[PDB]
């Protein structure tokens, strides 16, 4: 990915930009808000996530976000996850546990972190994008996510936390049901965010 992309992801870290389209708020918990935008022609959603995470340093947060070995230990929604280098770049394989009776979703993607200093500010940017390799074909019974792009930008809130901004889009390869969106919004994601906070405490 080009440097532009790294500097572009930081754009809304300071002032969230949700006035361009119909961004509807989905969940507000642990000082984190998650907004979604629907594309009515396709049925697909985009997501943006902003807030702060008090009681977890920004540098350590960037570290737990890229530490897959640790991720597997504390995150109960990771079925399988491992990294490899293909052409000098880190390719990640990630299988997400979906609730019964839906199939699990798996991701093959490029991932790259850059620690910046813009306007004297410590910021950490993580970019992720969908790729394919012949050596890692599709698994029967696991939906391969073939369109997927994510950004994350971490910063200090000022006292003793991390200010964050994340953009997320994928095509999940099937009709994500309303009960699953409801489950994720009201239980899944809140429980995940607190598990993740706990994960900073025990690094
Ligand atoms: C900002 C820094 C603080 C940490 C991140 C903050 C907040 C993350 C929470 C939501 C982010 C917003 C929207 C994304 C919506 C769905 C995500 C899909 C499953 C997933 O991967 O989500 C984990 C997050 O884990 C979970 O929430 C576990 C609970 C869900 C697991 C199963 C869900 C089934 C499908 C749900 C569909 C409806 C979703 C509606 C959204 C409320 C992402 O983590 P990651 O950034 O490390 O990337 C992992 C690498 N990967 C993506 C390639 C697999």
Author numbering: 8 to 210
Task: Reproduce passages from the article.
The titular member of this family, phosphatidylcholine transfer protein (PC-TP a.k.a STARD2), specifically binds and transfers phosphatidylcholine (PC) generated in the endoplasmic reticulum throughout the cell to modulate plasma membrane, lipid, and thermal homeostasis. Steroidogenic acute regulatory lipid transport (START/STARd) domain-containing proteins bind and transport glycerophospholipids, ceramides, and sterols. The STARD2 subfamily, containing STARD2, 7, and 10, bind glycerophospholipids species.
PC-TP adopted the expected STARd fold consisting of nine antiparallel beta sheets with four alpha helices. Our structure revealed clear electron density to guide the modeling of the bound ligand. The PC (16:0/20:4) phosphate group is coordinated by Tyr72, Arg78, and Gln157. Whereas the quaternary ammonium on the choline head group is stabilized by an aromatic cage consisting of Trp101, Tyr114, Tyr116, and Tyr155. Using this structure, we designed mutations to reduce phospholipid binding (R78E, R78A, and Y114R). Mutating Arg78 to glutamic acid (R78E) introduces a charge repulsion with the lipid phosphate group that would displace PL binding, where mutation of Arg78 to alanine (R78A) may have a more subtle effect by neutralizing the charge rather than introducing charge repulsion. Protein complementation assays in Huh7 cells, Y114R, R78E, and R120H all decrease the interaction between PC-TP and PPARδ by ~45% relative to wild-type PC-TP.
